[PDB]
């Protein structure tokens, strides 16, 4: 039940092991490595699509 995952490294021996010790999922560590996002709920929440090159009106 060991989860070997990728460590946070830079860009131009890179793995860590995790064992879960407790029977509750609230006892687990933080989910540091989850970087998913979609900003279209806030920046472009209009009904008809608005292409950049075309005039807005």
């Amino acid at each position: 039940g060991a989860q070997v995952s990728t460590q946070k490294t830079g860009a131009h021996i890179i793995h860590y092991t995790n064992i879960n010790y407790y029977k509750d999922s609230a006892s687990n560590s933080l989910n540091r490595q989850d970087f998913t996002q979609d900003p279209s709920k806030f920046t472009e929440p209009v009904k008809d699509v608005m292409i950049k090159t075309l005039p807005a009106l």
């Binding site: 687990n28 806030f42 009106l57």
Partner: protein, 238 residues
Amino acid sequence: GLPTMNTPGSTQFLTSDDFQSPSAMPQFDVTPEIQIPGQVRNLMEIAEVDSVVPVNNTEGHVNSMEAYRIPVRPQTSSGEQVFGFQLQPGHDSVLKHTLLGEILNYYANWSGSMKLTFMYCGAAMATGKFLIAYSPPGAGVPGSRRDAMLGTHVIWDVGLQSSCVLCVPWISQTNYRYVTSDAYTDAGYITCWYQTSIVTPPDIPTTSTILCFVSACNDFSVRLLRDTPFITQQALFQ
């Protein structure tokens, strides 16, 4: 038992740790989550939204809606300046309480391009052209419209589309600038000038209004979390 040895750092509280810990409520049945609209997974989704900039913040104007209203009018000669501020999106007084500016004050480093949107809120019969310029920080402030036409700029023609976007590019020697300003990571200046004038028909008010909006581009990133120097307390709130 298993022979062990304790390294330096045992029995400490590092507040940015990541360790497991036992539960005080074992086998607690957590209520099911539902679809709530508007989920936020990143603070860069918040910073990429337009937020109107108080460019007119010469007090006493900050205690009213006059702080957001950049005034323009018909001119006697052309090429005069409308406004101008330093491009310090976490330190300058114009940009540090905007919605992009408040997220950056939780961080120490910022990087990426920005979008300055402008919005002419005058009458539909009034026309006008404007030059909005960005200057890299080497030479100093531009002194005229001739000095400002040499840097990154855009000429905006006020028409049926009321808005124009000046895109401030990331022209830096480092990959990150500092949020609290210094001279090594200075980012430059933003100025606006009359390209022509405001020309109106009769029976129209003289002074019009321009609204400035700031947001981040899709290559924007922040780094090195910190406490913000905006909220304070001398005692616990009772």
